[PDB]
Design a protein around this ligand. Structure first.
Ligand SMILES: *Cc1c(COP(=O)(O)O)cnc(C)c1O
Ligand SMILES: *Cc1c(COP(=O)(O)O)cnc(C)c1O
Lengths: 412, 412
């Protein structure tokens, strides 16, 4: 047992969290961080939403403030209200009591409960991801032994969404397969299907009896409206109601700015069955077990902040405004960056920067160009070309626009 | 695919968190809660440590206060200081840079990291738990496909440690087995091996090349002295430095009263060898993948409080006093109960309640006696006869003394 770990290999640093580390140790005064999609304000610093500042003040003025354990399934105030913003107030699933909501460790925790659940009951089901999906998606499912497949999404040629490649993959896929869909604001591309395209996408999923899992991490950042950004999820909840179980992995890391507090919810819209009376508490019990065996119970403070935010009508209102505040500054920078490149006369077309939505911009820069931006210009992007627009501000947009210009011309 | 969940079994509630529910759903005004081992003051209310209050104040008074993502392995401030309280600042494992430390979702999260790491690299190793042990222990390891075994610990007849059977199991177990040890304040019995007995237990484990896993959820509650309570762990890391890697699952849930903030650390004391230059980084990158693909990164807020406590001298001196205040009240309630049963002339001997340490007492009551306590007296205990002394106070010890006197005469 003295040489037990001698054969264990070194895994490389995380694709996204690694760029954060390199950025941190870089001593150059010119460094710019456009890696991890974290919201930064006009001065390039983290921004605690006003709505949460107010909510945190109420929480601490409460005489019953403590750090006592929450239930295994989390805070009811959080779960109940969270499901309302995703599914909708006039939701059939909610009204019919077909929704199982449990508090998880943000969006990743919700995705892990789904993967662990799948690996225990339906280990054979293939997990389909978007060709250019979130960097951690594959690992989450493969950490549980599930086999993952890929469906066309991004067409590099036209910088558009390959709708025919997507719909084909849903047809040429085993009946009952799990399709992981980005509800809105596609991390990495930032290109979502239109309302019309979502109908086709969901009708295809309904005809093959496939299981839809909506990874919801940016509700509020696509259009700045919560209801508009939940169109895909609600559309699937009505159509897959008699077809298959709907999985919703909700994260408050971005829209509520909770990030490191790990606040999120795992939802499950059961199918219309007569025996749902027993099924409901049956599955819920399975979930409670997974949570108890791995985490015991979820973090309280962050969950208490979001609950009060969702409960209190004036903080819910202020939160809506904080999201328009964030989504509007990101738009102003998409324009500022595109116009600077147009003024610099940078080769090629750059309108895709403003056309894409969300927090990012799939620039279309080659790995070579991305490497030079870091090593030569101290600008940090994801090796894929993805850049966090929130890292841009009036004080650095031109420096970044000139750096991009140089690297595009350098490899021309 | 509509009937996928029409065959999923229904699992029973948590043996511990279930008492909390049933107790909460009780209308009786004369009810006492001796279920979950969560500290309560003299008025029976949650008690946020005075030192924790001061640390939490400084964090919010910080201009740079935010909710950003921490690194995958956590707040370095937390992990470094936490390693120092258990290992000791003068530890050879620390001075030799042999300890890997990452942040985890409290003690359960750390125990889970252990199980997944073993499940992933050494699947056939058996995990030995004490008889009896913490109710959730088994599920953490079995959730990862690991086979569990047990070792004689508590002897109900003598109400003492079955050292020879404990030692016989160690000797008979296949070399390289994992033994989950309770550092101090054993859950549920409240019975710990004396310093001399620990020497024998550790020597036996060393002789058989066994792997020691110290579940440290009560450092500071057994004797009310941090160093005194880290004896077994320090002994283990010393004697096993040339034999096997030592795993340490540390929780701040009880000693720091963080409970629901989920603050803990997973520590790993590697064996002595020149290959550590590559082993340490390789094993560390492995642990990071497990965290990233399951929960991404750990809770920010609770880590900051405890971190502030440990690194601020006046705050840490206060933390030591707070732990004495807590452990002091528990010991006060143990004597009050024993003395009340003696005065009532309750059949049998009850010195075991005062002989035990930590916050529990394995009372010896039968499951039926326990069942009659809440079914007639509204006194909630764990089915195994375990009672958390913290739930007792000057306003109810007399009442629980009478309720117990009644059940002992009724059945026996
Ligand atoms: C941020 C994100 C998640 C989950 O984030 P958590 O911080 O773990 O909640 C999931 N998917 C995408 C695309 C994300 O951007
Ligand atoms: C409390 C406790 C743990 C872990 O508790 P967390 O609240 O999840 O940190 C682990 N083992 C024992 C024996 C405990 O009492």
């Amino acid at each position: 047992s003295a040489t037990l770990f001698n054969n264990i290999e070194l895994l490389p640093p995380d694709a996204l969290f690694g760029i954060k580390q390199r950025y941190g140790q870089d001593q150059r005064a010119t460094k710019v961080d456009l890696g991890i999609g974290a919201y930064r304000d006009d001065n390039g610093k983290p921004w605690v939403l006003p709505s949460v500042k107010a909510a945190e003040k109420l929480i601490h003025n409460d005489s019953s403030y403590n750090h006592e354990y929450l239930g295994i399934t989390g805070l009811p105030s959080l779960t109940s209200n969270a499901a309302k913003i995703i599914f909708g107030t006039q939701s059939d699933a909610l009204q019919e009591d077909r929704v199982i909501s449990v508090q998880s460790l943000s969006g990743t925790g919700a995705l892990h409960i789904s993967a662990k659940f799948f690996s225990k009951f339906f280990p054979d089901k293939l997990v389909y991801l978007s060709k250019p999906t979130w960097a951690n998606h594959m690992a989450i499912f493969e950490n549980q032994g599930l086999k993952t497949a890929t469906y066309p999404y991004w067409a590099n040629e036209t910088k558009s969404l390959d709708l025919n490649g997507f719909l084909n993959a849903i047809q040429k896929a085993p009946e009952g397969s799990i399709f992981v869909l980005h509800s809105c604001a596609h991390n990495p591309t930032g290109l979502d299907p239109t309302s019309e395209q979502w109908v086709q996408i969901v009708d295809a999923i309904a005809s093959k009896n496939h299981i839809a899992l909506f990874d919801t991490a940016y509700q509020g950042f696509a259009t700045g409206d919560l209801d508009k950004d939940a169109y895909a999820v609600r559309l699937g909840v009505e159509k897959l109601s008699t077809v298959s179980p709907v999985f919703v992995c909700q994260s408050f890391a971005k829209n509520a700015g909770m990030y490191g507090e790990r606040v999120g919810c795992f939802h499950l819209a059961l199918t219309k069955q007569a025996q749902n009376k027993t099924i409901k508490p049956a599955v819920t019990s399975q979930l409670a077990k997974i949570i108890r065996s791995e985490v015991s119970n979820p973090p309280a403070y962050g969950a208490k902040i979001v609950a009060k935010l969702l409960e209190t009508p004036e903080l819910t209102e202020q939160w809506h405004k904080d999201m328009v505040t964030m989504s509007s500054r990101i738009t102003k920078m998409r324009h500022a960056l595109r116009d600077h490149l147009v003024k610099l006369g940078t080769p090629g077309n750059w309108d895709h920067i403003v056309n894409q939505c969300g927090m990012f911009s799939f620039t279309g820069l080659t790995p070579q160009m991305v490497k030079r931006l870091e090593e030569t210009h101290a600008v940090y992007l994801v090796a894929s070309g993805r850049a966090s627009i929130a890292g841009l501000n009036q004080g650095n947009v031109e420096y970044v626009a000139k750096a991009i210009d140089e690297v595009v011309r350098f490899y021309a």
